[PDB]
A paper describes a structure:
pmcMicrotubules (MTs) for m by self-assembly of GTP-bound αβ-tubulin heterodimers into a cylinder consisting of laterally associated linear protofilaments (pfs). During incorporation into the MT lattice, GTP hydrolysis is triggered by the catalytic glutamate in α-tubulin (E254), which becomes juxtaposed to the GTP in β-tubulin at the longitudinal interface between dimers. GTP hydrolysis has a destabilizing effect on the MT structure, and polymerization can only continue in the presence of a GTP-tubulin cap at the growing end of the MT. Here, in order to better understand the GTP conformation of MTs, we used cryo-EM to visualize MTs assembled from recombinant wild-type (wt) and mutant human tubulin in which the catalytic glutamate in α-tubulin was mutated to alanine or asparagine (E254A or E254N, respectively), making them deficient in GTP hydrolysis.
To test whether the presence of GTP rather than the E254A mutation itself has an effect on the structure of the MT lattice, we generated a more-conservative E254N mutation at the catalytic site. E254N MTs grown in the presence of GTP also did not hydrolyze GTP, as demonstrated by HPLC (high-performance liquid chromatography) analysis of their nucleotide content. Next, we used cryo-EM to determine the lattice parameters of E254N MTs (3.8-Å resolution from 13,706 particles). The 13-pf 3-start E254N MTs showed an expanded dimer rise of 83.45 Å, similar to E254A MTs. However, in contrast to E254A MTs, the pf twist was positive with an angle of +0.13°. The lattice parameters of E254N MTs are similar to GMPCPP-MTs, in which the lattice has a rise of 83.95 Å and a twist of +0.23°. Comparison of backbone deviations for the tubulin dimer between the E254N MTs and either GMPCPP-MTs or GDP-MTs clearly shows the E254N and GMPCPP similarity. Because the weakly EB3-binding E254N lattice conformation dominated at low EB3 concentrations in our TIRF microscopy experiments, we assign the cryo-EM structure obtained in the absence of EB3 to the weakly EB3-binding lattice conformation observed in TIRF microscopy. Here, we found that E254N and E254A MTs also do not show any pf opening at the seam either in the absence or presence of EB3 (refer also to Movie S4 for a morph between E254N MTs and wt MTs showing the rotation of pfs proximal to the seam). MTs to which EBs only bind weakly show either minimal pf twist of ∼0.1 Å (GDP-wt) or they show a positive twist (GMPCPP-wt and GTP-E254N).
Author numbering:
A (entry chain E), C (entry chain A): 1 to 37, 47 to 441
B (entry chain H): 1 to 429
Write the structure that this text describes.
């Protein structure tokens, strides 16, 4: 009745999806064999038997990760129809993943998407998971998003983009991939969620006391975020909320749709006690900049819009009191022309702890989605890097030989500057 | 945290360090193989400050052994309690300075200083938080004095913020093992007053006196003296590696004992000291230890404090005790020795108490006295040097190794300035 | 509804807090695990479970003491959030603890303070425990008190300062630390309690017959004093009293707010019998100068103000009779311009003996807080010492190299002289 499909590009996308579907299975009490020893109708379809399968699509050019998924514990769960594999990865080259190699299987992915869509009736939207550094990520995301937006006129489209960290990088040509893919996705993405690895590293080390965190833990956190986002659809609440509500409440202007996510509470198992976890307490934890999942201090900007999804046993009266108190603060400042920048959603289902995980089970949790102007600053940094790596025309020859024009780089930089200018200009106050 | 890097120069320094690391391993219950088999978590909680845990739960001493001759390093590698050392640490040349300070500071030192500094920087980056360095060497041998001065100069030029400790065996007044040691002693002391934070002057004369008389031993070997000095050092640092009702660290001692930057030379003293038979004929009382620490015969520096005044006094106690008792002892002893302290410093006793005793005994005490009498010592050395510089005897070795007479002139001038400052501040009212 | 938070600087502060929270747990019947097999609402917050945690903050630069606390019996009780540790102690150097090292964690301590304050609603005041000799004590006390007084305009602030003994010293530079920290705290401290180790040594040796007392016993005594001070808030009485009452009744002038504490009864367990412990008897015991916890004979000065807190089964009639008799005495002389220098408070809860302790349980106890002019003399002595150690400019170079000016020493000495002059001048009588 209300279905939403998933797409995973690149190794980051695949691992994030592993965590996400793991979490969803844990939620709806689903065995790795599709059995459950309605609720699940949104994400799981049901075969003739009592077995269920997830409406998921996995795509990559390197078959190693998909082979790991097939040989992983969640083997029997997936439908081997969707586990699309290529031959050679884009190799951190947007040109390969957007002009040369992605063409080989773009048709196959589109066909699988259409077949899944035709068997669904309450199609809500697309959850695209993909990094930015990897050429697979940028190229295939650009291609697939363009194709889908061409096909379906107006349907929800959500991305969970792994924004490259300011200093902690892994690749070398990350500015190029990021700039190209952002210039592309600026026109197609309904609403994209920036997430950085460095911020999650900081959060896990300081708050969860894990001195050496692995990618698994970051994937756990992002899966928690996604589950809390969709819990309003997947369950009932005193005040539910849909994705169209989000896009209506968080997009004052058609271009500015790049919020960031934050989650709470996050405390070690040994620290489950020693605090009562007030709704005001978790509110403060959310709004504390040390918990925001993108390396930007909001105190340098204004929250243009904020949304809070609570799950568990919550009461709107105290929630409203805490929010009103938050508004009374000074450093948390919004635009003058926006009188109220808060949307509230409540769900009765508390989150469930991941077995073998690192967090501790709680009775109330809150996810925050904030669209502010501080995030604008982040873009500038990347442009900075790009400019240097573009001043010497370094690494350009790979893309040139792959069928790309320098004018594309110039125009992408211009579009990034235009977006940053729009962000800053909206950040200003109104006359009279 | 607050890890301390140990450096040893000179043959005496190497022997002292061997015995000292033996003592440390015994205290923390560390076998010669380097594995911990102790029974008190206290040892493991602060083991990092002196050891590094390599995988398979092995422990290695954070020490550096330096010389220019292979004999001493070969001996160390030969005997037990040598395996646990990191075999790459043993930096050594082939010649040996040979009591020529110019060789140990200009020619030979310039060859191995690179490797020494490389290993030092590696150790520094290996540790979490650097507290300071403790150095072991001599002042007679050219190796010890020259290379120690060179390393101290370079390190201080690399770490102006860290604290530096030196345990320099000052040559004895009466007995002299060499012929030319006044020259190198003067030069090394010049460099020390230049670039050191505290110097624990020690003489073999006083150690021999203590071993022969107090311990009642007619045959004191170098092993016994080295064991005594090792016990002194362990007692100095044990306020860091163990809890105590009133703890101290190197920084606190440095602040307390140095009223003015030049006057930073101390003398140590240890208690109790009992023979094999004369042990159960005495009660182990805080008053007993206090009175044992304060007397001419029990000072490891050949200089009567009665001839001068105590600028500052520090005391570190080990084993359980009551603070009030120690306070009473301090007040009584300051009352009776009112003529033995500077007037312009009221309450010149710096107390600290640990909570772990020295092996099989019940309690112990270590005394660190920064007094003025030591200048007399220096005086005598200068006089020796003075005579030996009037005829410029043996000068040609240093002259042909690059040093000039102006160096000796400046060194004696600086030493005389230091002695004048000490005497003047003793006379301060 | 009425909450008051604690801060502990330096080893002295930490050990004193150990004793204090031990005593409070013994009072409210609190297990080391926050269970109690309202009253506790003032000092203990309650988690979701039946577990309670103390609103305490521990700060030090040497991690050894905090590690001992963590490995001590009271491990599970505390919240590991607040056990703030540094790397290198101030090392009896006020400059290190006030300009160089304290800056490293001052923000963290302030953040913890603010978070604790926001979860409390009846915030009463701050109980700062810190010695004076230790550079950690002086430096961090100055810094933190300045920050808190800057933040909160008018709220109660109480210190329990370990004044350095006249003759029995432990450090060497104690005059410098004491002078600097006193010059600082003169403007911020609402009300500070002088306590000396030598006086407590004397009291324990003579009255409790303990020939060799340890720091533990002194901590027990000070914990008893603090518990008796707050018993009026933590319980009901025929005539209760609040901290604002104390500050109104003991501060005739804005600068003179340095009282001293005394406690009674103090008798050995073997001497529990052989006296009936009259209210007049305990009154005499309190007013006897041999029991005052600061090395100053009040007979050399005048009591400007006195306050008596009784706990246990007491009756105001006989209390008033005993006080009136006390007034009739001669050597106990006040200022002519003050007609009555007594405040009285009564609580129904008798003190409880510390298990494994040295004292004996009683049914009535009395704490006395006296603001007199004799204490003024004490300051002079320190100045004396300082002058000598400042005449030769000894030890100055450490502070100079740490970012301090000799003019600071000169101005601190001048301010100390000004305070002593004010004390003596108020000590005089009035014209006509
Ligand atoms: N959040 C998160 N991000 C990851 C994780 N693993 C990798 N990433 C990010 O994702 C990127 C991985 O590159 P991909 O997008 O998968 O590129 P690819 O699939 O290897 O294809 P090529 O670009 O041709 O190499 C890296 O730059 C990482 O920054 C993960 O486990 N969690
Ligand atoms: N206290 C103490 N001093 C020692 C001991 N062994 C040697 N010494 C002193 O240390 C000095 C040894 O000379 P070093 O400084 O090591 O010089 P070196 O390494 O032999 O090199 P050269 O100066 O060229 O001979 C002697 O002068 C002794 O006075 C010892 O066991 N205990
Ligand atoms: N009442 C009481 N006072 C104590 C106790 N232990 C120590 N003190 C006093 O507190 C001081 C301890 O120094 P701290 O204030 O803790 O200084 P620190 O933490 O060591 O930091 P540094 O000043 O850099 O050394 C000593 O001077 C003692 O006089 C105790 O158990 N009870
Ligand atoms: Mg790839
Ligand atoms: Mg030699
Ligand atoms: Mg300290």
């Amino acid at each position: 009745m209300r279905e939403c499909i998933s797409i995973h590009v690149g190794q980051a996308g695949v691992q994030i999806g592993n965590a996400c579907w793991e979490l969803y299975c844990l939620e709806h009490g689903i065995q790795p064999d599709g059995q459950m020893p309605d609720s699940f109708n949104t994400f799981f379809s049901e075969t003739g038997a009592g077995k269920h399968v997830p409406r998921a699509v996995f795509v990559d050019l390197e078959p190693t990760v998909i082979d790991e998924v097939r040989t992983g514990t969640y083997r029997q769960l997936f439908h081997p129809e969707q586990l699309i594999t290529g031959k050679e990865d884009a190799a951190n080259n947007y040109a390969r993943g957007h002009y040369t190699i992605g063409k080989e299987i773009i048709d196959l992915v589109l066909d699988r998407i259409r077949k899944l869509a035709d068997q669904c009736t309450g199609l809500q939207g697309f959850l695209v998971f993909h990094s930015f550094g990897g050429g697979t990520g940028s190229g295939f995301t650009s291609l697939l998003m363009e194709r889908l937006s061409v096909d379906y006129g107006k349907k929800s489209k959500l991305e969970f983009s792994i924004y490259p960290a300011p200093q902690v990088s892994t690749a070398v040509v990350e500015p190029y991939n990021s700039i190209l893919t952002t210039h592309t996705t600026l026109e197609h993405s309904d609403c994209a969620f920036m997430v950085d690895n460095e911020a999650i590293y900081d959060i896990c080390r300081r708050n969860l006391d894990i001195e050496r965190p692995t990618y698994t833990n970051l994937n756990r956190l992002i899966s928690q975020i996604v589950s809390s986002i969709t819990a309003s659809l997947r369950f009932d609440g005193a005040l539910n909320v849909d994705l169209t509500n989000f896009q209506t409440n968080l997009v004052p202007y058609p271009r500015i749709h790049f919020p960031l996510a934050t989650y709470a509470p996050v405390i070690s198992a040994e620290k489950a006690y020693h605090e009562q976890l007030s709704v005001a307490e978790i509110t403060n934890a959310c709004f504390e900049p040390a918990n925001q999942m993108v390396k930007c201090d909001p105190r340098h900007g204004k929250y243009m819009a904020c949304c809070l999804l609570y799950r568990g046993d919550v009461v709107p009266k105290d929630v409203n009191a805490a929010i009103a108190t938050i508004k009374t603060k000074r450093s948390i400042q919004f635009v003058d022309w926006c009188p109220t920048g808060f949307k509230v959603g409540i769900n009765y289902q508390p989150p469930t702890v991941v077995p073998g995980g690192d967090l501790a089970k709680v009775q109330r949790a809150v996810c925050m989605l904030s669209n502010t102007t501080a995030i604008a600053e982040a873009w500038a940094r990347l442009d900075h890097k790009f400019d240097l790596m573009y001043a010497k025309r370094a690494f350009v020859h790979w893309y040139v030989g792959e069928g790309m024009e320098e004018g594309e780089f110039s125009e992408a930089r211009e579009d990034m500057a235009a977006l940053e200018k729009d962000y800053e200009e909206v950040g200003v106050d109104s006359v009279e | 945290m607050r890890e301390i890097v140990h450096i040893q120069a000179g043959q005496c320094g190497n022997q002292i360090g061997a015995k000292f690391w033996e003592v440390i391993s015994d205290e923390h219950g560390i076998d010669p193989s380097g594995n911990y088999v102790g029974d008190s978590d206290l040892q493991l909680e602060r083991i990092s400050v002196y050891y590094n845990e390599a995988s398979s739960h092995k422990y290695v001493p954070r020490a550096i052994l330096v010389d220019l001759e292979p004999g001493t390093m070969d001996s160390v590698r030969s005997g037990a309690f040598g395996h646990l050392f990191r075999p790459d640490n043993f930096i050594f040349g082939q010649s040996g300075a040979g009591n020529n300070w110019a060789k140990g500071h200009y020619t030979e030192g310039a060859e191995l200083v690179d490797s020494v500094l490389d290993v030092v920087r590696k150790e520094c980056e290996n540790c979490d938080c650097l507290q300071g360095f403790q150095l072991t060497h001599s002042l007679g041998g050219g190796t010890g004095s020259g290379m120690g001065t060179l390393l101290i100069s370079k390190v201080r030029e690399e770490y102006p913020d860290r604290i530096m400790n030196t345990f320099s065996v000052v040559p004895s007044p009466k007995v002299s093992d060499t012929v030319v040691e006044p020259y190198n002693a003067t030069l090394s002391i010049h460099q020390l007053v230049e670039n050191t934070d505290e110097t624990y002057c020690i003489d073999n004369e006083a150690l021999y006196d203590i071993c022969f008389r107090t311990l009642k031993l007619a045959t004191p070997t170098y092993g016994d003296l080295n064991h005594l000095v090792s016990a002194t050092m362990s007692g100095v640092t044990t306020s860091l590696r163990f809890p105590g009702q009133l703890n101290a660290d190197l920084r606190k001692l440095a602040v307390n004992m140095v009223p003015f930057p030049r006057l930073h030379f101390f003398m140590p003293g240890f208690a109790p000291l009992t023979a094999r038979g004369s042990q159960q004929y005495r009660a182990l009382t805080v008053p007993e230890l206090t009175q044992q620490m304060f007397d001419a015969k029990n000072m490891m520096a050949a200089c009567d404090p009665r001839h001068g005044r105590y600028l500052t006094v520090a005391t570190v106690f080990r084993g359980r005790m009551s603070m009030k008792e120690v306070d009473e002892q301090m007040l009584a002893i300051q009352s009776k020795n009112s003529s033995y302290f500077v007037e312009w410093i009221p309450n010149n006793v710096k107390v600290a108490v640990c909570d772990i005793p020295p092996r099989g005994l019940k309690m112990s005490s270590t005394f660190i006295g920064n007094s003025t009498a030591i200048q007399e010592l220096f005086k005598r050395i200068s006089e020796q040097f003075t005579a030996m510089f009037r005829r410029k005897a043996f000068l040609h070795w240093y002259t042909g190794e690059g040093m000039d007479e102006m160096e000796f002139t400046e060194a004696e001038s600086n030493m005389n300035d230091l002695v004048s400052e000490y005497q003047q501040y003793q006379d301060a009212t």
